[PDB]
Structures are given as structure tokens and as C-alpha cells.
Amino acid sequence: ASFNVPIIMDNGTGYSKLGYAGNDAPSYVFPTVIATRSKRATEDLDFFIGNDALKKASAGYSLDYPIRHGQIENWDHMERFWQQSLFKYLRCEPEDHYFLLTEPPLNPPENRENTAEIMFESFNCAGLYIAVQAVLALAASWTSSKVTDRSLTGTVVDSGDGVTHIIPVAEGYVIGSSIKTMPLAGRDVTYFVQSLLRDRNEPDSSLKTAERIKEECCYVCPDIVKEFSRFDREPDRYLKYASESITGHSTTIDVGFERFLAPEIFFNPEIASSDFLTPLPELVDNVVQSSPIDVRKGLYKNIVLSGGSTLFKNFGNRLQRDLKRIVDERIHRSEMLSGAKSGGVDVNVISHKRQRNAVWFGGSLLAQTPEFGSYCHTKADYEEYGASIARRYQIFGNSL
Amino acid sequence: ATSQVLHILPKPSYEHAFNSQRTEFVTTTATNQVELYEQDGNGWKHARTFSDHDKIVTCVDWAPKSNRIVTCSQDRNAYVYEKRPDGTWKQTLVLLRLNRAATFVRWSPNEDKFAVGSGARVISVCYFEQENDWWVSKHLKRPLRSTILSLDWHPNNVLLAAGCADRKAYVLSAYVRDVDAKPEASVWGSRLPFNTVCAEYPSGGWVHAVGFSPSGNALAYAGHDSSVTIAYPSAPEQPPRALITVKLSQLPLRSLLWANESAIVAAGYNYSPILLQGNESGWAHTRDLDAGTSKTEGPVSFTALRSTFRNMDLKGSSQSISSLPTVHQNMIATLRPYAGTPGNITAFTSSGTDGRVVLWTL
Amino acid sequence: TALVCDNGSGLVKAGFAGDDAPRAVFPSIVGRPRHQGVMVGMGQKDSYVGDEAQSKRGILTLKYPIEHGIITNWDDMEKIWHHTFYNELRVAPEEHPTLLTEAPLNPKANREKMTQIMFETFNVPAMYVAIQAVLSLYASGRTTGIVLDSGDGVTHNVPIYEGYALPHAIMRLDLAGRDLTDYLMKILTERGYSFVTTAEREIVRDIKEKLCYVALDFENEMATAASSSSLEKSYELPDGQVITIGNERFRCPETLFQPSFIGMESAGIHETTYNSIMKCDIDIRKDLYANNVMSGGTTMYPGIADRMQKEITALAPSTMKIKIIAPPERKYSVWIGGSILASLSTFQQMWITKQEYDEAGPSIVHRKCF
Amino acid sequence: TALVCDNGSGLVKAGFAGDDAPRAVFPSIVGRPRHQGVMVGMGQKDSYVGDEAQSKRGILTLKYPIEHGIITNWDDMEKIWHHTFYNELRVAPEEHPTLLTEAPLNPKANREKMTQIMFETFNVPAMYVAIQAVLSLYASGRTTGIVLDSGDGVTHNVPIYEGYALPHAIMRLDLAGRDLTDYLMKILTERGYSFVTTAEREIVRDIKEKLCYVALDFENEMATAASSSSLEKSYELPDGQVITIGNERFRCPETLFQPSFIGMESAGIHETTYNSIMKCDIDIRKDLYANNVMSGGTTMYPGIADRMQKEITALAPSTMKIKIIAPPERKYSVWIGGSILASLSTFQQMWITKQEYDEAGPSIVHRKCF
Amino acid sequence: MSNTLRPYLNAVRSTLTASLALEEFSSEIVERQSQPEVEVGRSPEILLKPLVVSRNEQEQCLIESSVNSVRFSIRIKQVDEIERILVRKFMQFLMGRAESFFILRRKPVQGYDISFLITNYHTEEMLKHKLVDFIIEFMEEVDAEISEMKLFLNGRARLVAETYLSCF
Amino acid sequence: TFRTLDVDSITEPVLTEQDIFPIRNETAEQVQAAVSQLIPQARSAIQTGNALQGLKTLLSYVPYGNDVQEVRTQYLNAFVDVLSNIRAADIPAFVKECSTEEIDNIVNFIYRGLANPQAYNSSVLLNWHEKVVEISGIGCIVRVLNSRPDL
Numbered sequence A: 001a002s003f004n005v006p007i008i009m010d011n012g013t014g015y016s017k018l019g020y021a022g023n024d025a026p027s028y029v030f031p032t033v034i035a036t037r038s039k040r041a042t043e044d045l046d047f048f049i050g051n052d053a054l055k056k057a058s059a060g061y062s063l064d065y066p067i068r069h070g071q072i073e074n075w076d077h078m079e080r081f082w083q084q085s086l087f088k089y090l091r092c093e094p095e096d097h098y099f100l101l102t103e104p105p106l107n108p109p110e111n112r113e114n115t116a117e118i119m120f121e122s123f124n125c126a127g128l129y130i131a132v133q134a135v136l137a138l139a140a141s142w143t144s145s146k147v148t149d150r151s152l153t154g155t156v157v158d159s160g161d162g163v164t165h166i167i168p169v170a171e172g173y174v175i176g177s178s179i180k181t182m183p184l185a186g187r188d189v190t191y192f193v194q195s196l197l198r199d200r201n202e203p204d205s206s207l208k209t210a211e212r213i214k215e216e217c218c219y220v221c222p223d224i225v226k227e228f229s230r231f232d233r234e235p236d237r238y239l240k241y242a243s244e245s246i247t248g249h250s251t252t253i254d255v256g257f258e259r260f261l262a263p264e265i266f267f268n269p270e271i272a273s274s275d276f277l278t279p280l281p282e283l284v285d286n287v288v289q290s291s292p293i294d295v296r297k298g299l300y301k302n303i304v305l306s307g308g309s310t311l312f313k314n315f316g317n318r319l320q321r322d323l324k325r326i327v328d329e330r331i332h333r334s335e336m337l338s339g340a341k342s343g344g345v346d347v348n349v350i351s352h353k354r355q356r357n358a359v360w361f362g363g364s365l366l367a368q369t370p371e372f373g374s375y376c377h378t379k380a381d382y383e384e385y386g387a388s389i390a391r392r393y394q395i396f397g398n399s400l
Numbered sequence B: 001a002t003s004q005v006l007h008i009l010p011k012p013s014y015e016h017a018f019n020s021q022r023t024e025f026v027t028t029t030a031t032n033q034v035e036l037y038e039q040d041g042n043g044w045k046h047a048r049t050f051s052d053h054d055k056i057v058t059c060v061d062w063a064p065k066s067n068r069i070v071t072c073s074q075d076r077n078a079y080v081y082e083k084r085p086d087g088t089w090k091q092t093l094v095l096l097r098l099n100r101a102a103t104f105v106r107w108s109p110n111e112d113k114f115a116v117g118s119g120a121r122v123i124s125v126c127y128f129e130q131e132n133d134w135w136v137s138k139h140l141k142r143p144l145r146s147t148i149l150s151l152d153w154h155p156n157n158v159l160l161a162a163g164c165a166d167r168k169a170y171v172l173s174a175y176v177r178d179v180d181a182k183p184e185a186s187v188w189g190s191r192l193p194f195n196t197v198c199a200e201y202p203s204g205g206w207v208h209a210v211g212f213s214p215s216g217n218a219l220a221y222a223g224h225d226s227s228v229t230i231a232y233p234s235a236p237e238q239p240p241r242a243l244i245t246v247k248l249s250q251l252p253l254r255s256l257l258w259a260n261e262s263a264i265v266a267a268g269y270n271y272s273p274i275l276l277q278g279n280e281s282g283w284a285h286t287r288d289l290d291a292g293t294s295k296t297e298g299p300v301s302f303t304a305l306r307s308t309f310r311n312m313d314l315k316g317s318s319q320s321i322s323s324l325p326t327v328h329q330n331m332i333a334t335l336r337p338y339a340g341t342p343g344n345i346t347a348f349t350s351s352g353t354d355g356r357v358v359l360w361t362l
Numbered sequence C, D: 001t002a003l004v005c006d007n008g009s010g011l012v013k014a015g016f017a018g019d020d021a022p023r024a025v026f027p028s029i030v031g032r033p034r035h036q037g038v039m040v041g042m043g044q045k046d047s048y049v050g051d052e053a054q055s056k057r058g059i060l061t062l063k064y065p066i067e068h069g070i071i072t073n074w075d076d077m078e079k080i081w082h083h084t085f086y087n088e089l090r091v092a093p094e095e096h097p098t099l100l101t102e103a104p105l106n107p108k109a110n111r112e113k114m115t116q117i118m119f120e121t122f123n124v125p126a127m128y129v130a131i132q133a134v135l136s137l138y139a140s141g142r143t144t145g146i147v148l149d150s151g152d153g154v155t156h157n158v159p160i161y162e163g164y165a166l167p168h169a170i171m172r173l174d175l176a177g178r179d180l181t182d183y184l185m186k187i188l189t190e191r192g193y194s195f196v197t198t199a200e201r202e203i204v205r206d207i208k209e210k211l212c213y214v215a216l217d218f219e220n221e222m223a224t225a226a227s228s229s230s231l232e233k234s235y236e237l238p239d240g241q242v243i244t245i246g247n248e249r250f251r252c253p254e255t256l257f258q259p260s261f262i263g264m265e266s267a268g269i270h271e272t273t274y275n276s277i278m279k280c281d282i283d284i285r286k287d288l289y290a291n292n293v294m295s296g297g298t299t300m301y302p303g304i305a306d307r308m309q310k311e312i313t314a315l316a317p318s319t320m321k322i323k324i325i326a327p328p329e330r331k332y333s334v335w336i337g338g339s340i341l342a343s344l345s346t347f348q349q350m351w352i353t354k355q356e357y358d359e360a361g362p363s364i365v366h367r368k369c370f
Numbered sequence E: 001m002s003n004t005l006r007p008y009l010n011a012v013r014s015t016l017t018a019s020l021a022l023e024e025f026s027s028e029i030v031e032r033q034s035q036p037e038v039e040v041g042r043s044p045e046i047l048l049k050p051l052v053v054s055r056n057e058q059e060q061c062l063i064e065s066s067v068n069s070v071r072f073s074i075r076i077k078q079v080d081e082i083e084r085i086l087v088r089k090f091m092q093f094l095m096g097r098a099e100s101f102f103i104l105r106r107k108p109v110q111g112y113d114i115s116f117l118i119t120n121y122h123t124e125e126m127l128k129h130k131l132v133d134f135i136i137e138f139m140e141e142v143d144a145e146i147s148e149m150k151l152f153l154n155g156r157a158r159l160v161a162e163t164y165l166s167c168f
Numbered sequence F: 001t002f003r004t005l006d007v008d009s010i011t012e013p014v015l016t017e018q019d020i021f022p023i024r025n026e027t028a029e030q031v032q033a034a035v036s037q038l039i040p041q042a043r044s045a046i047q048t049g050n051a052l053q054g055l056k057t058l059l060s061y062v063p064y065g066n067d068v069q070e071v072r073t074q075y076l077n078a079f080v081d082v083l084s085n086i087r088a089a090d091i092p093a094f095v096k097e098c099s100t101e102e103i104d105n106i107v108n109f110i111y112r113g114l115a116n117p118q119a120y121n122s123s124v125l126l127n128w129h130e131k132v133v134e135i136s137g138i139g140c141i142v143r144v145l146n147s148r149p150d151l
């Protein structure tokens, strides 16, 4: 492999985190959005991305998010997003560098195939590793890079903008049969905040204002009928949020029960959706109880949080208490049949200083390894087998 | 030759059979179902489904005198259907004992047995035992080497012709004791026990169709090479008097029917019934029964306004895609008697992959 | 399927994409009681909509939320849209995309509030706003022509050549069937009959819809009516008393050809059509003249197509064939062409979607619906 | 068989060697939509070329890639060449050697770039670039003469004696048919007709082709047209409107004899032709005067050969005959002569072959072609 | 486009239309299943002989045929390295859409640029004369499509040259 | 692991092509002599300018077999050379007078020619294909699809 630093690109549904292996942060963290125009033809040169795309809606560009619900679904826009990432922001030559890419555990064979042909034929990268994204978020949880600080067994709950998935990993191996996914994350709680501002007919219900009300005003409560009652009993529970309009004037928004009812989307997904029903503490139980019996203590002892939509105030404490309730009720059913007390299991949900970008920090830490260039597809593999080299699922069991 | 389109089925129709009075017909759709159609004035109405098969139904046949339907499928089964006094149909599974799909089925002329062709290198000759209340199956298996594509019964109840994907047409004894009385001496033989082989006639391509002459004294068969061969036997262990092949200029015939002792109608991938005429001195393609072989401002409705914009949007232009000149728009799969005494078929029906059921008058 | 809602100034016309005609057609009216509600219970309501307002009208003040193609009252327009979805079509609007319509040269805010109410009040999955004359050209089976569309509140001309609109040549005229109804009230007053209330304005609209017609030569018809009983005929009011009228039958529609009858300084609908053709580039004019398409209820008068052809033949050079296309279904051609458009497969990519509105706000309509 | 193209400055003439006339003759034009397509499912294309651009011109801005015999837009020239091959002649360019054609005194880059595009973009097996005036002698059956060739973009004189060209006596004049269309648009304005757009230029080109002629004595013709309406004619626009035309009917083509009408300091076509003969060696002049060949569309005006013989007879010494050979097929004589040349058995070693190009680069054309 | 291609595309049309005499046929090697037999090859009696139609060493068809399926594969004109890149990538976008063009393969057979599989079901559910019209109209146009793409590439190389070189 | 071991190839031997098509009733040197008598007649008919009789005589016998590729390719060299020397105006009058078996042999050997363009001129074989299919119909190609694999 080349001696140049690998380039790390976590392309999320909400945000892309771009940087180089071994740095103390991503070089860029900006929305996974493209601004596109809607006698020589140049409208495919005229686009913008990230923070510079958000500035272009008033100039008549159509904004789009080429990743939705965790999966790339517009390969024209994702190719233009990557070329602009590589040549504007990272300012790099693909021929000199190995790349770490990411996508959700479910992601189609078709997506890794389409990713490999853009990377090896459009850009001609030296080599590509498409990582299992929340497996990197386990490695970001270490107290330091030294081997004695590693905890190679843990459940990881990743919750970004587009999807939340719970991954069991034990001794560094991903138990792919036990992956659970909930199709609801940080964007669906924004659409719920937006919908509640809109039901009150508030002066502003733009998407940025609903987003900023999540980041600043929202938190996870114990129980929504007790918390609705606390919003009768105590008057300063309602906040006032000052927002500036697209046409440049002030507004003031009263923010109310969406402060607790919007983060409740994870703990009662029947608020968000007709199609998904199991709450996150029961969904994490289903991951560990489908997983092999000898790893269950290790998977409960280390439940790592990952992705921006896990950062709600009191989120890890609600998950820990509700999962500890599920776990001890199941252990006590067995103690009451057997007539003897167990040792129990400690359920620990872990929030940590790198939790916001744990996939990128893990990708950086794993791409720093001396062995890394041997796990990549090299362009010499792609010259023989084409994009079919990337098609086989890494995380799940394959037939053949 | 006059033609009348009786009905347009919503899905392909590899087989159909009318009852003896031509007052209802049964057809295999391309699914696991079978459709029963009754008259509705001059039209037809979907009376009921049968759906006892698991996989695609391949063939269906209706016994004239005894009023029973037999059905075959890629599920390897057959069902016999018999009419109840209240007007519903009693299904009955027949244990064919086939390793692969049932491909083709025919009732015998006396209707006391039927035969099922298969992809399993064998034919299940099925008969009923009153001592057990069972349909039971005998396997013809000795010379057969590939999928049996079609069957026909001799006018005497014993001999079965079979068209095979090994490029051969077989004549085999399907004689069953305590069902058949002894067969009369014939040009095919007289010592005639089960699975004795009366002929193994060659073809240039897969034998899609077989058919005995109305007297039984000759066999016509049609190959995927777009030929019809007519075989005139001499005796057991002796080569035929004549083995006359007529080679057509069109796509292959899939189905075949003697109009009289000196004429055959045939049809298939050419989308059109042809007439062949001849005898043991020679045979010739003599007519096409479909005139379509010759390749032959006012107020406008909402469905024409909307479809011309959908055609502009989805396709190249407003202009609708034209019909083929033949009445059938796709291959015509089966060809069956409709009127006239046996030996003088005056009208016949066809059904096709386009779902048209069509009546032809000679 | 998708809803098509041609919410015009005088009639709401609504239904489903791919249907032969609108299955909901009702007055674009909200009615409110103007009298002492003395009996307790009695099935009384705070307001009434459409045919319910039109049948109760003797006790109601009637008002249209839409005038000159512009929504003037959004609270009553939501009341009308609710009546379309829940009462008249009997659908969940959150289950169906909706094709809406408006006249060209409308205020920008009309399109914005119309998209906002569809996504935020009616919770629609997707919507689009079409220009009404562009829809009427699909209903003609044509991809070139000039469409003269005249409804209740607005008349407009849109020229299209081979699917390209010429937006500089588009004409609007804020004169159509409501101005003709108001003028028929003003001239009925001269023969003896006063119609004054918002309820009596519906009686004289019904007189206009079956007594009135367009003269081929106005001064000859005016002289023929001034000298004979033969142009005069009668109508019966709800009260059973009879109205007889004569030259009022063709003086009312003549205001489309002579807007000065209502004090307007504008060309008539014939000369406005010719001025739109003459604003187009010289090579396209021949095919516009051969394709003058009539639309909307104010084009339903007897003799108006024969008059429009006579008048445009005098303005155009004699060297070419003027043809006026006036289908008997032209009462609904905007809705008919909306049901064509909403059923095309490329149009399924042209919808504003819920997710895309939520990301962009109501300004998304100005950068997607033209 | 070889291909032959006169890539003229106004028309493409294309076809096969040994045929009597071009298989394809069409406008050397690319048209692009200026308006927005409002109609879904229409046959909307990114650009149109040739007769399809000319047919659709009312909605297109029209551009010519060739100006004054120089390719100014290589993308639109590549669109025209792609259209000649795949749409008009409908043959693959790899299959036949192609005779292209050029005006004398062109930029060397024009011929190199034309060579590079044929061998590397269209992958032709062999090609050649002939001078348009040399081909006009092949069509005329001559090996001696002076050719006055005048197309849409350039007018040029080439004197040839017994198969030898005199390249010092070659004359170019960047004034031909397009400059006469520009001037007819300008002098139509003074009778009150306004032609401005790129499509109205094509109507004025048709007016010039249908009605203009060369006046044998300009001041007698100006006095005639001032005295009576007998010189006036009428043309009907695509709008059905009629325009009538008088002295501007012959004052337009007079710009060939009087270039100062369009403000340019140069000799008229008679004086450049005489100056070309007077640059030749004294013994050959006597035979050049008898063998004036006229070619290209701007030599098609009624009366131009009579005017040209009159003016050359006034310049030349009266002791010897002036004869001008202006044949009725002269509109296609460059292509006809290219079909003759590419058909000669003695020409088949003169092609630049692909194997001979890619050992030398596109400068091979300057040593294989004149 | 069809003056130079006419003899070739007439031979392709005629033999593709002869080859599409397809039928429902279940497997002789697997029970209760049917498979496109040209694509599996496990029972040779229901395979028809593979036919090559060719204009040139570089411009060829392979027609492979069976009781229930035809596989049709083509080599297309690639006379320079630009066309080798442009053709390969255009066929990859076209085969990436194969679910919506129901008769496309997702991969070509080795040594061919694009490939088609027409099965019994396609001849039952689609107009088979319009299937062979789509094959021949694809073969008629693809050389004009690819040549126009190398004009667009030339036009962009001029765009960046003129934009770059004009800002000194 | 077991999944990849081919048991079917040894427990259920499939049909061979000689189970479908009858064995050639002539030896390799017997057919090689029969063709070696015909090729000199086919060459000689070109020199007298009677290439139509060159085909009519060459077409009177055809070699087949997987044991005879050398003489099959020599016969194909003579066939394409004969077809290249017949004038294009003679083809319609010759095709209508061929038997169905001679037509079947012509359309079979133009197909063997079209399979190898570095040896054979496709332009004349496609011209012959157009005219043979126009006059004798689609069924002649259907007979080639159905034909023996060692022709």
C-alpha cells in the first residue's frame, strides 16, 4: 500500500464527516446535501455541497439529500458529492490514497457495487475499504488506542439522521444474525417537532428551526403522561425560542410538549410510524437475547451509544433503566421458578466524549493500523473482477 | 375458411377443452388455476375456477361421454373433476408417481383411462379401480428418452402416440387388462402388450404434435424444424410404406389435427392454421385458413386523448402499435375438433398464448 | 391515482386522474345565515358550502372566497377544500396526490398559500399547480394551439407551440362570467326587474346560463330585437312570477366583445386572442390561427364560436384558415386535461412531494410548477 | 465509393462519388429552444440540425457554425457532420473515404482541425480536402479557366491554366450570400418591414432567393423603379401577410458589384475577377477571359452572367472575346466536381489515409492537399 | 441508422425472429422448477445450435437458443480507445437498468459488450415483434449514440480549455 | 466442503449429441476423399465463369462430424469462394430453382461463414442471406437452428 494517510469519509443521511487517518477530529462535518440547477452544457459542473449548498436555495438551486434512510439512492448526486469532497474540500488525489467509506449494516449489494465503480473508475482511488459503520463506533469508545484499553465485546446503538441500528459485536466479530434496525432517527424526530410547531400555527416551522429546537430544547423524560402533567404543575417548562426567517427578520416561537414528546419517538415509535412498533429498550433486548448465550453479559455490560441522535439529555439513562427493567424481570422469572437468587447482570449504557462522530473516529483509528492496506480492495483487484468484488455482504452470513 | 373469436382470456391459454355439447369450455391459464367458461347469450362468462394444483397447470382435457375434466401441472400431479348432482365439481387427486412435471394429458376414446406425458422420461397411463376407488398409474418408460411434449390415442383404445423432445415420435401400446378388451389386429400390430413399441419415427426437431388418422392406419407428427411428417406403417418389425415429410416456409407447428383421411390442419408459431392435403403417394401444404397470411376525421373519446399522451410519454409517439394480420397475435398452442362426425371434422377450435379462443369452419 | 381539483372562481370541479369527467361539481360558495335563528335544534349550522348553500340561499348571505382567480378568503377556501375531500369526493387527502390549478399572472402568494394549506392543513402526500390553459390543451388532443379559457372570474389566452409556451404572449383579462352576471343584473333593472341580494345574483346567473347567447352581428340583432317580438322569451323565478327578456339575451355576452359596456378599457376576447397570436414569433402564427381552443363555462354561449371565428377572420390576413375548436365538453376541458396530465408517467416525477416541501417551505412551488 | 461533402457556409451538400447530384442538401444550421417546454411527453430535443431546425425555427435560436468559410463553432460543426453521416446519408463514417472541401486563403487551423476530427472523432479510413473552385472546373469539364465561386459565406476567384493553379493570382472576398441577406434585412426596414430574429433572417433569405435579381445597368434600373410600379413584386410571409418589394429587389445583389453598400472597402466581383486575370502571366489571360466559370448559390441571380459579361468587357481590352459559363446546375457544381474527382482512378493514391495521418499528425493535409 | 448496417440487421432480425419460437418448459433435472435452459445448459436435447451473425470481425451477434429461452449477445464497433471506454460504461448503465428493460442480462457473456435474455414469459407477456424491433433499433442507433457522446466529450474539453486559458 | 462436488455427472449420465442425431454412415477417409473429388470441380467452375454450376455441384454432398474439421473448413473455404464469385443478379433465379435440402445446405454454410469474418467475407454472405430468406421464407433459418451440431 501507499505511505500516504488514508482518507476517511463517513457519508451519513444528515451529515458527511470527511478527514485523514490519525487526526484529533474530522476536517469537515457538513450536511450530505447537494444544490443542483433545476451554448455548451455545464449544469453538472454548476452544483454545490454541504454548508455551501445550504447558501444556494435563495439562488434557485434545488437541494437534495442523495442518502435517505441510511442508503444512497441517487448515484448521479453521490458521484458529484464525492468528486467535490475529494477535489474541493479534502483537496486530494485519489491515485495516491486509500479510502475508508461507510454504509448501514442492511445496505444492498447494489450499493457497494455502485460505490466501488465510482471510486475505482471515476476517481481511480489506489484502494477502498467499505466499513461496517457502527463496528467503527465500538473502537471510538476506547479510553486510548493501547491494546489494554480495548473492549472487543459490546452492543452498539447507532442513531444518526436517517436510521438507527443496534449491532452486537463480541471478541471483535459482528453477530450479523442479531442486527436490529429501526427506520426512525434524527430526521423523523425533526419532522415530528416541525409537525407540532405547525399544529400550533407557530410563526416559524422551517426544517432548520425544528432541527435547532431538537439540539437545544428537547430531552428524554421518564413517562409522557407524568411529563404532560409536569407542564401543568410548573410554568417555566415552556421555553421561548428566537428564530430568524429565510427573508431576514426576527420571530419568537413558544416551545412546549415537543421538548419531551419528540425524543419519545425512540421509546414509543408508534408515535412516528405505522410500520415500526418495537421501542428501543425492547429492541436492544431482542439483539442480546438472539445473540449467543456466552456473550450476553459482555453485550449488556458495554452498550455503546453512537451518532448525533443519541445525544438527547437523559437518553442513555432512559435506555439503561428501561433495559435494566426488561433484563431483571426476565432474570427474576427464573429466580422465582428455581428458588435461588442469581448473580444478575449489570446493564451499562455508555455515553463518551467521541459519541457525536464515533464512526469517523473509529474509521480513523482502524485506518491508522499497519495492516489496513491488506483489508482494502486494491485497484488491481478491481481491474480483474470489476465492481462484483464489493458485492458480497461482509456483516451477514452468505450462501455459496 | 370462416373464423370467429369466441372469447379473449386475460392470460395465456396453452390448452382448452369444450364439453360434448360445446356449451361450456375449460382452459388452463398460465397460473396454477383452471378457468371454466359457460355461454352468456352469444358471449361467454367465467363460471368458476379450479385451484387444487400447487404450480403452473400445463394441460387440461374434457371427456365427452362421461363429462369429466382431467388437469395436469408442474406440481407433478393430476386431478380428475367429476360433476355432482347439485352442479358443483368433485376434485380427485391422481397419484401419477412422476419424478418431474406432468406436461400433457389426454383421455382415451372409451374414456376408461387417460395418459399423462412428463419431463420424467415416462408417460403415466392412468385408469380407475372400482375395487379400491382409486385412480392408479402405469408407467410407459422403455424407449422414451426426454420430455414428452404431446400425446394422441389411436381410435382403438390401446395405442398411444407420443411426441418427444429427443426428436422422435413413438407409437406405444397402452393396453391395460381389466380395462381394455383385446385389440383387433392392425397395421401397428396384434401381439400388443403394455409398453410394446410399434414405431420410433425420426424428426428434424422436437416433436411438438402427434395425431393418428381417423381410421388409425397412419400417424401425422410435427417437428420444431417447421415440418409435418406423415407415417404409413406396413407391419410389425417392418419399415413404413411411406414416410412423407412436408417442410413449411413458416415458424413451427405446435398443434395438429386430421380434418379427414386425406387432409390435416396444423398451427403454431406461425400464428395461423394451415391445411395440408395428400395420401401415401405424397402430401402438400395446400391452403392457409387465416386470410391474414396475405398481410391484410370525427369526434374523439377521453380514452383516445389520454392514451395518445401516455403513448407520447412512455413510447416514441402518439401512434398505437398495430395488430398482426392473423387473428391470433401470439403462438397458437392447441387445435381441437368442434363440429362434424369423426373422419370429417367440419369445424375446429384453437387457443393461444394471446388468450384468444377461436372457432374455424372449413 | 391522484385527485384533480380545478378550484375555479365560480364552480369547484373535482375528481380522480384517469376519470372521463369530474364527479364533484359544485358552487365555489360559502353561505352564512343573515336572519334570527329562533327554533332550537332544527339541524342548523354556522355556515353552509356548495349545493347546500345554493339550496338554502333564501336565508344566507352567499360569498365566493375566490374573485378574479385569486383567493380573497383563505378560511372559507379551506372550508371549500374540506368539502371537496371529505363531503364531495369522500377521500382522505393524506392518501392522494392533488393536482391543483390557477390562471396565469396570479399573485405569487396565491400559489404559496395554496401549497402551504395543502401540505400543512390537508396533510397531502404530493401536489402540483398547473396553468389552466395548459391543461385545456391536453383535453384538446393538441400540443400546439392558443387556448382562450374564460371561467367565472378571469379570461386568459395562452399560446403554445409544439409544447413550448410563449409566456410574453400570455394575456389575462379580469372579465368573465361574474362580470356578465353583474351586467345582466344592471340591464334587467331597465325592463322592470331588480335583483340585488347575493341570493338573487344566483337567479340571474341561472337566467344567463339558459337565455343568453352571442349574436353573429350585434347591430343587426339589436335592430331585429328593437323591431320584433321574435328574439323575446321568458323565465320563471322561484316565486313563480315570470320574467320576459329580449335584447338583454345578447347584450350581456356582447360585453366579452365590447368590455366598455361594463366601463373597462380593454380589447374584447377576439382582439385579445389576435393580440396574443401577434405577440408570438412569425412562423408559429399560422398554426395558432388553425388551433384557437375555447374553454370554461363563459365559452358555452350559443353562437360564440361562430362569432369568435368571424371576428378573428377580420383581424387576421384573408390568406389563411382560422379554426375555432369549441368541444361540447369545453365546460370541463381544464379538469379533463388535468386528469390526463395527472395520469402520465413522467408527471409522477414532477409532483412537489411532502418531504421536499418540509425541507424547502412554500417557495418550492415557484421553482417546480414552472 | 467515396463520400463527398461541400460543407458550405450556408448549405451542406453531401453524397457519394460517381452519383450525378448530392444525396443530401440541407441548412448548415443548429437550432436550440429559446422557450420552456410546459407540455409533458412532447418530443423535446436538446438541439435540432438542418431541415428539422429550419422546420421548428419559430421556437429556436438558429446558429451557423461556419462564418466566411471558417468553422467558428466546432461543436455545432461536429453536430452537422454527425447528422450528415448517421441521419442524412445514414452510413457509418469508418466505412467510406470522405472528400471534404474548403475555400482558398483559409486559416491553416481550419483544415488541420477538420482533418483531426475526421480521423480521430469520426474515425474515417481516408480523407482529402479539395479547393471548391478547383472542383468547379472538374464539373464544367475544363482544365483551363477562372472560377468565380460565391456561396453563402465567401466569394473567391481561382485562375487555372492547363491544370496548373496560379496561387498568387487567387482572390478572396468575405462577401457572399449571408452579407446579401443581412443587407436585405437592413433595406427592408426602410419600406417599414422589420426582420430581426434568426428565424426572420431565414424568411428574408427566402425573399432574396425568390425575388432578387441583378440589374444590367443599376442607374437605369433605379430610374425605372422610381418611375413606375412595374419592377415591384409581392411575397407572402408564413403569417399570411403580404410584403411588396421594389428597387430593393435589385439594390440588394448590387452589393456584389458595389461592396461599399455594406460599408467595406473592396473591389466588386467583376473587378476582383479582372484583377485575378491581370495577376496572371500575359499569355494565359486570353484563355482565362473566354473561360470565366460561375459557381455556388450567390451566382444564381437572374441577370448576373449578363451583368458580369458587361462589366468584364468594359475592364478587359476590346480586341478579344469575354465568355462566361454559368451553367443551370452551378448551385451544386462544387459537389458535382468533387464526385468526379473522388471517382477518378488517377486520384486513388491522393487520399490521406489513417495509417499515413497517424505517423505525421494533422499537418499531413498541408503537403497532400493544395 | 441503416444503409451500411441494413444487410447485417436484416440477417439479425430474421434469425432472432426464427429463434423466438419459445414455450413453457419445466426442468428435467430439478422438480417443481422451471429455468431458462440456454442459461443453465444441463440438458442438451432442448438446446438449439448457437448461430453467429457478423458484419465484421469487431461487429458480431451470438444467438443461443432453447425450448424456453434465447440468449442474444453482441460485440459493437469500438474503433478507438475513447469508444472502448464510452461503450463499456454505456452498457453498464444500460445493464444496471435491466429490471425495467425485462429482456436484458445484468452481465454480458464473456467477449461480448451487452447481452439479452428473452424467456418464454417475455414472449407470453410482451409483444415479441416489438422485442426484436427494440433489439434491432438498439443495434441501429448505439453507434450514433456513442459517437455523439465523444462529441460531447470534445465539447467539454473545449469548455475547460477556453475557460482556463481566458483568465490570464 | 461437499456442496461443490459434482455427483450428477457420474450418477446420471446425460444424453450425448449422437443420441439425438444418427451416427454418420461413412468413415473419415471416405468423406475426406468424397470432398477432395468435389473441391477441384468447384475451383474449376470459377475459371470457366460458371460459378452457379460450381455451387450446384459442390452442394451435391456435405461433410459433417467432429472428426473432420480440416475437410469441413476446406469445404467452407470452397463454399465462400464460390458464393463470392456468383454475380448478385443471378442469386434470385438460382435460389428459386434449389430444392428445400439444397436451400437448407446453403443457409447452413452461410452461417458457418458468418461465424469466422477474419477468414470469410461477411458482406457477400449477408447478401446471400437476405435473398435466400426473402425467396424461401423464415423456415429455412428454423431448419438451421434445428440442424445437426457437427455441420
Ligand SMILES: Nc1ncnc2c1ncn2[C@@H]1O[C@H](COP(=O)(O)OP(=O)(O)O)[C@@H](O)[C@H]1O
Binding pocket: A011, A012, A013, A014, A015, A016, A159, A160, A161, A162, A163, A185, A186, A187, A211, A214, A215, A216, A306, A307, A308, A309, A310, A311, A312, A313, A356
Ligand atoms: N445535541 C443533539 N441532541 C439531539 N440530536 C442531535 C444533537 N446534535 C445533533 N443531533 C442530530 O443528530 C443527527 C445527525 O447525526 P449523525 O450521526 O451525524 O447522523 P448521520 O450519520 O446519519 O448523518 C441530526 O438529526 C441532528 O440534528
Ligand SMILES: Nc1ncnc2c1ncn2[C@@H]1O[C@H](COP(=O)(O)OP(=O)(O)O)[C@@H](O)[C@H]1O
Binding pocket: C007, C008, C009, C010, C011, C012, C028, C150, C151, C152, C153, C154, C176, C177, C178, C205, C208, C209, C210, C295, C296, C297, C298, C300, C301, C331
Ligand atoms: N351554458 C352557459 N352559458 C353561459 N354561461 C355559462 C354556461 N355554463 C356556465 N356558464 C358560466 O360560466 C361560469 C362558470 O364557468 P367555469 O369554467 O366553471 O368557471 P370557473 O372555473 O372559473 O369557476 C359561470 O359564470 C357560469 O354562469
Ligand SMILES: Nc1ncnc2c1ncn2[C@@H]1O[C@H](COP(=O)(O)OP(=O)(O)O)[C@@H](O)[C@H]1O
Binding pocket: D006, D007, D008, D009, D010, D011, D012, D150, D151, D152, D153, D154, D176, D177, D178, D181, D205, D208, D209, D210, D295, D296, D297, D298, D300, D301, D331
Ligand atoms: N436562387 C438563388 N438566388 C440567390 N441566392 C441564392 C439562391 N440559391 C441560394 N442562394 C444563396 O446561396 C446560399 C447557398 O449557396 P451555396 O453555394 O450552397 O453556398 P455554400 O456552399 O456556402 O453553402 C444560400 O444560403 C443563399 O444565401
Ligand SMILES: [Mg+2]
Binding pocket: A011, A012, A013, A014, A159, A160, A161, A162, A307
Ligand atoms: Mg449516520
Ligand SMILES: [Mg+2]
Binding pocket: C008, C009, C010, C150, C151, C152, C153, C296
Ligand atoms: Mg375557472
Ligand SMILES: [Mg+2]
Binding pocket: D006, D007, D008, D009, D132, D151, D296, D334
Ligand atoms: Mg459551397
